Design a protein around this ligand. Structure first.
Ligand SMILES: Nc1ncnc2c1ncn2[C@@H]1O[C@H](CSCC[C@H](N)C(=O)O)[C@@H](O)[C@H]1O
Ligand SMILES: Nc1ncnc2c1ncn2[C@@H]1O[C@H](CSCC[C@H](N)C(=O)O)[C@@H](O)[C@H]1O
Ligand SMILES: Nc1ncnc2c1ncn2[C@@H]1O[C@H](CSCC[C@H](N)C(=O)O)[C@@H](O)[C@H]1O
Ligand SMILES: Nc1ncnc2c1ncn2[C@@H]1O[C@H](CSCC[C@H](N)C(=O)O)[C@@H](O)[C@H]1O
Ligand SMILES: Nc1ncnc2c1ncn2[C@@H]1O[C@H](CSCC[C@H](N)C(=O)O)[C@@H](O)[C@H]1O
Ligand SMILES: Nc1ncnc2c1ncn2[C@@H]1O[C@H](CSCC[C@H](N)C(=O)O)[C@@H](O)[C@H]1O
Lengths: 282, 282, 282, 281, 281, 282
């Protein structure tokens, strides 16, 4: 949709906040203690940035553990909604996977190829720019598909049909996602990020219809709540310190801070769930 | 029922361990800090008994909070799988509910009424020896059903259907239960307690087919883990201190001790969720 | 006897787990390398059953070696606490002994004679339902008594006195047993098996007061530890593979699994010795 | 200075609260689960003092764990700001260390010595009534120096210079202290106890300039916050229980309660950090 | 030399014993409990080959554990004396490494390449038909070099010199080998397999003179002694089972049995050590 | 007896073999794996010496663990049969004990005071030269007594009476010792070292008579067997390498080697037991 233009235009802010390096993640970070680190020695934007980065990697490491990526994500896999390729390179390098990276933000694909060349995995990571519900996917059967915080953009009934045609029997669909637990329980997240979160039931119903079984359903809501404290704290540090900010840039950072507070309030209100689902194709 | 007789044989040990009347609870306790109490001066059996009982009440006090017991559990309710009446009297005394307590252990029904009479609520607490998913009940339409750690013995598709007919529109089904998060994630729990734990997804599927919306899905695994520490230390204390135990009782307590360690381990292993659900009748 | 009835109720599970006749053993197996067998290709229940049985025979073959069974256990012997006859037939068949097998489980006496008859040794193996430390036995003086993992149920001061009268000068008492090495070092063993383990010192004191010299005190704790690995893996295999198990049997097997881990832990903790003793009558 | 006299004056009000032991401790307690014990039906002053003393002892056990006192704190050590000798005796008895206990409260020195004898380690524990930033180096090189809640009273640069000359190479300097995490973050603590708390960076800079390497930094703010609830409860239990309290001591106790209430609020406000540090020479 | 031709000749007798996989291994097996599996009622040649292949694979899993192949063996590495490529493929597949596989048996090079494709790592595994002590350094610096049972064929000083120029600083050199523990301790092994086994000290001296630091030394003699019992059993199972064996191959098999019997006796005589070593540049 | 003159005269050989340093032990070493280390890089006498020394320290560390020396051996204790003070300094320094070191070899006491001064524990370690069964012991009640491989020289009935007068109630007697398990089962050890080993029963009988209870009985026979391989190997290395040996010194080393082989053969023949006993005064 317009979401590809919305993801295009914030390329600059993502590299500012979640860069640099070759692996830039754009998803919430995982704090296995449900507590944000205390930042004392160093309260500059770069301190929160590196802490956000490290715990965003912690999210991937945690997922590969509970999903047993050693055998389930080491083969030929789809990285649906790849962002800037942080996840894509993570599977390619940590588990040797051959990755097809999918995005509807064209500005992003060349960045992912750059970063893959960079780490030397350009022969095992490929991008393609299309909608993930209409994608023609040459590349034979894939052993798995991973969606880190992108399935909220998808039509789930139709998306799971798509994956049923391109995933071999017994292949996995691994989803990290914001879900509702009550109705409207993720509205702040939904309206601000142009997503349409549903319940875990909705995902399971749509996946069952296309021939997938739910084999794992993990609640990481409490372990990802600290991400909003760090995300907020970073935004405050930039506003507080950098005096080269134009009035326009300063207002976007302000709007980002205002949103991070309302998102963090929602996260703990009990109406949403940060989940890790894994489906197996029947 | 084999398990109905299993519950009858438990009464004496249930009464000794979960303390005297009038409210005797047979569920896990709720430790809001996810820390076990440090019993530093007094490590007697009665000291762990009291702490276990205090937090078993806390479970109910907590559940009353998240479920809005003041309007949702203050009317004509079903208390399904009622144990020795602890939850029955709680709802009847703390929220004025008219409680119909259901159980398949005949030995327990007179116990509960003898305790309801003692508390001056004998006219608003009656029992029904019963299979939860079978009887007609001519108690007119019901405002709510509560099931605290009993629904694991039930055929959830059939049980929700029963409830659909006896519950009024918008009436609630409130569940505290051990669910699986992946297949086999509660095998110790299942085989030791004759229980058939299922995933929260299955509960939602079964309740939907019967006409119920899931409107709340709270986690409390880490807040109930300290209960296994406390229950293990009670059993250790009794084995260490009580020298008037028959070899038969001592063996049961040694067995209970082994079970409590396996259960506490399983609580931590990730395959298991202690959650609170609330459904609403369409 | 409460424990006599406990042994009667065990027969079916004893027969299933410790393999079919004619020699059915109910003691720990003896692994001379203190290593458990690596079952690399076949991890079926029957594969662990066979290995357990092979090493249960090895226990007897080992004990025959260290005890000089050729001259010491080839005559008129008592086999006290005889189980299902495994040891009885071993001594009768491998060393030509005339065996009087003693037990307090009435269900087991016909089992043993049906197996002695099948092996053509029915005239040199008779049973005696009995308390070990009570009956008169008019089997004339005896050359030896053997007690393989049964003496833990006995009053050792009284039991050695009985034996002193029915044994001839220089006759041997051969014991394999779980002893304590410090108080409480075998509490799991004791409470789960209704047993009263004592230190080797107590056995020596009791046997001295009755007229017996201790002439051999062998350790075999580390050589019998692998048995708990094997017994645990058998139980795991049955739970994993056998889908026709009643909830009752499944629960017993889940309980046995928990017990086997606690026992294997206790075997390693230092409070416990699996030893072989030989006494000689003065 | 006036501080050494300030410690002299509160000797009796401090043996009442934290005594009698032979080990009296004057530092916060360590609650490993980060919550105070629920106190049963005994809510008397002695019930709370016993709990306070318990977790005070636990703080030293925990410091001894993370510092590996087995090797690092079992030799010839300085106990810098020994209070009433509770920490000094601890190292002497639990780790077979020889301890030189430094204080600027001359009244406390006899009390530490008397208690060293009654424990039978008087031949392993001597006192030094002096300023910590002017330590007699006659007495040979020391293995380590430990400062439990005393270093907020020190000129850190100067103190670490003194330590650089009395401590062998590789010697450890083990510190438990209230640090700041931001400016004015420990002002209630500072202005009430006459300390100058500084950040962890300040401490590492001063240690560096004297040849010391920061090798360990543990945050124990959460685990010591309940001390203020037990310390507040004890005070309330005293005002509530004994009606044979003079108006003057009843007002001193009251002021301590208001202080404990202000101190515990600042402990959770974010601006402060109860930390454990170790430097190597 | 004559060795490279000696490896060429035994290609068929070695695919028979240790194939077919796509991973064929030519090193002893690792039996972590130090005893061979009791073989049931299936005592056929394939039953033993499967067991031999199992613990051969386990040796590489165990080496990967103690070497931490996650970081050290997951980059651009040399597989020095790659045999039929079983170890090469292992590092490519299990640790996402890029592998240059060196051998002096030219017949083995196609077999390693063919198997690299069939596993889909042919773009991560190239071969080098050359002498290990004359390695082409064009091909950029390597992260590590691994030598599973090949270094007994090497001039260690010269080989480590070559390694010092092709390996980045901090690069690892991971060796599994038969070492001597005393003079003549591996003579059966040496004279049968055309090797010159040396002690661990010899290896560390030669590595040092080329700038390498010995950082790990594990003794696995006990855990690899059962390989000779399984290897002997397999041979017996073949002589016993198939009566359509030519006299010539029946005599070659017989000689291998006498060899395995002499080799396993020397493995327990004390004079030899199956070891795992790691050097850092 | 003459044993003090026998212990005097081998002062030279003990320092040669088990020195130097301040802690020289003269007891068997403890190898927790029951396997002697493989010595390959370095097979000189000094390699075996240091390995013997290290595992002799391992014996003390193991004993303080199973005896909980932190509270049981940190007080005022008797080190009966102190040798050259290795054990004495170990308790004084590792657990802060105040040690009275007893010996009948006067040449040895000044060596122990030297080594105590040396380590700075001269104020907490004192020697006295007398027979351990007639010793006047001023020094109030002692909290414990330790005997590492010396009680074989003592009259056990009489020695335990002595300890009953000087040990406070609840104090420990900690014995490491060679014991017989069969008669004559330690004859090689006994005749060569002028000891009179008895059974564990004999020790318990004598200790019970003077008011002690046996609370711990550990079998370390298998863990100390490797000591004879190292002790032999050292003796061979000295004979093999050192060419400055006189014919007399070379014959004593030969005689020592011949004895170490016969002692090592006895150790595994099953007739002796290397034990760690702990008695508590009633
Ligand atoms: N309809 C659609 N089809 C394909 N990709 C879409 C899409 N809508 C949104 N996306 C992509 O989904 C991603 C959401 S955030 C990126 C997630 C990334 N895997 C990470 O965690 O690092 C963006 O890359 C966005 O471009
Ligand atoms: N099939 C069935 N039908 C109705 N009740 C059942 C049942 N199977 C088990 N139960 C009941 O469910 C309860 C299990 S635990 C007791 C729960 C109680 N609400 C408490 O927390 O104190 C017992 O009352 C048991 O008798
Ligand atoms: N009081 C008693 N008198 C006689 N036998 C007893 C007894 N108590 C228990 N036993 C027996 O002791 C045995 C325990 S285990 C079975 C042991 C058997 N020798 C074997 O190893 O196969 C059982 O036969 C049990 O019936
Ligand atoms: N300038 C100074 N020189 C030496 N000691 C000082 C000092 N200023 C304060 N102190 C001492 O440092 C201690 C602070 S509080 C006491 C801490 C003690 N280790 C305990 O935990 O119990 C007091 O003994 C105080 O007298
Ligand atoms: N001089 C030399 N240069 C390079 N490779 C050599 C060599 N001499 C022997 N080799 C090779 O080293 C290997 C020895 S055995 C094969 C080892 C292999 N890593 C495996 O475990 O399967 C053979 O491939 C042999 O051809
Ligand atoms: N009758 C006796 N009275 C006191 N000591 C004796 C004795 N007979 C032998 N000893 C002493 O007992 C010791 C035996 S060996 C020394 C053991 C020492 N604790 C160690 O393990 O390091 C010698 O010191 C010897 O002199």
């Amino acid at each position: 949709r317009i979401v590809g233009q919305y993801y295009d235009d914030k390329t600059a802010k993502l590299v500012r906040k979640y860069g640099p390096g070759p692996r830039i993640h754009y998803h919430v970070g995982y704090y296995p203690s449900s507590e944000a680190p205390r930042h004392t020695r160093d309260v500059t934007p770069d301190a929160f940035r590196r802490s956000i980065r490290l715990h965003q990697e912690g999210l991937l490491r945690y997922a590969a553990k509970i999903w047993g990526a050693e055998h389930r994500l080491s083969g030929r896999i789809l990285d649906v909604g790849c962002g800037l390729g942080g996840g894509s390179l993570f599977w390619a390098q940590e588990y040797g996977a051959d990755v097809t990276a999918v995005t509807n933000a064209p500005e992003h694909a060349p960045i992912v190829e750059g970063f893959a060349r960079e780490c030397g995995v350009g022969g095992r990571v490929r991008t393609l720019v299309c909608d993930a519900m209409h994608l023609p996917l040459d590349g034979g059967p894939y052993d798995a598909a991973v969606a880190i915080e992108s399935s909220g953009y998808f039509d789930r009934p139709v998306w799971f049909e798509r994956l049923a045609h391109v995933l071999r029997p017994g292949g996995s669909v691994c989803i990290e996602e914001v879900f509702t637990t009550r109705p409207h329980g993720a509205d702040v997240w939904a309206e601000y990020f142009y997503t349409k979160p549903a319940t875990v039931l909705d995902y399971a119903e749509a996946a069952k219809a296309a021939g997938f079984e739910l084999v794992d359903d993990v609640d990481a809501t409490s372990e990802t709540l600290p991400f909003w404290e760090e995300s907020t704290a970073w935004t405050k540090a930039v506003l507080d310190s950098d005096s080269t900010l134009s009035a326009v840039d300063r207002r976007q950072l302000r709007i980002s801070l205002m949103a991070n507070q309302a998102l963090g309030a929602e996260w703990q209100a009990g109406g949403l769930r940060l989940g890790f689902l894994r489906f197996e194709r029947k």
